[PDB]
C-alpha cells in the first residue's frame, strides 16, 4: 500500500499525540527529537514502540535524534524517510 | 463472568511484548513492576500508553507498582482488576 510521509518536529513532549494520530491513520511518520531533553526523547521512543507494536508497524532509527514508524502494509525506504526529514 | 485478565510480571523492558500481545488480542492486562527500577517502570508505562493510544484503550494505576491496560469496550470494572491483583 502507498503511504504519505508525515514529518514531525517535536516542539514539546505533548507532541506524541501527533505521531500517534498520523500513524494510526495509516501514515508513515518521521520524527525529530533535537528540541527535547534526553529523558523526553527516551519517553517518545517508548511510546512510538507501543504504537508500532499495537498496529504491527515497523520502527527504525535514522540518526541520534530521528526515528520513524512505518505502517505494516507500507514499503517506505530509508532514503524516502531521510528526504522527508530533510537529512 | 470469566473475562480475560492477563497477569504479567515484568523483569525487563523486553517483557513489554507480553503486555502488547494480550492487549492487541482484546484482553485486559494487569502488570506488576515491583522487580523494575523506577526508570524501567517509566519505560513500561510509556510503551503501554502507546498501545492504549493505538487501540483506543484505557489505562489505570492500581497502586505504585501495578497498572492495567483495558480494551475500549471491555465489560471489566476497576474492582475486578483490583480483585485479580
Amino acid at each position: 500500500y502507498q503511504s504519505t510521509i508525515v514529518p514531525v518536529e517535536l516542539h514539546s513532549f505533548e507532541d506524541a499525540q501527533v505521531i500517534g494520530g498520523a500513524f494510526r491513520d495509516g501514515d508513515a511518520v518521521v520524527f525529530d527529537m533535537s528540541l527535547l531533553s534526553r529523558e523526553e526523547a527516551r519517553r517518545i521512543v517508548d511510546f512510538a514502540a507501543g504504537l508500532c507494536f499495537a498496529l504491527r508497524g515497523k520502527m527504525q532509527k535514522i540518526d541520534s535524534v530521528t526515528f520513524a514508524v512505518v505502517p505494516e502494509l507500507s514499503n517506505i525506504s530509508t532514503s524516502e524517510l531521510e528526504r522527508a526529514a530533510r537529512i | 463472568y470469566q473475562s480475560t485478565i492477563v497477569p504479567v510480571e515484568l523483569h525487563s523492558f523486553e517483557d513489554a511484548q507480553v503486555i502488547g500481545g494480550a492487549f492487541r488480542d482484546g484482553d485486559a492486562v494487569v502488570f506488576d513492576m515491583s522487580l523494575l527500577s523506577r526508570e524501567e517502570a517509566r519505560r513500561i508505562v510509556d510503551f503501554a500508553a502507546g498501545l492504549c493510544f493505538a487501540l483506543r484503550g484505557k489505562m489505570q494505576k492500581i497502586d505504585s507498582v501495578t497498572f492495567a491496560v483495558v480494551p475500549e469496550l471491555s465489560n471489566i470494572s476497576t474492582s475486578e482488576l483490583e480483585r485479580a491483583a
Binding site: 514502540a49 508500532c52 507494536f53 520502527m59 532509527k61 | 523492558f13 523486553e14
Partner: peptide, 9 residues
C-alpha cells in the same frame, strides 16, 4: 544509547 527495542529489530 537511544535505540529501537529488540522485538522491533
Amino acid at each position: 544509547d537511544l535505540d529501537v527495542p529488540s522485538f522491533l529489530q
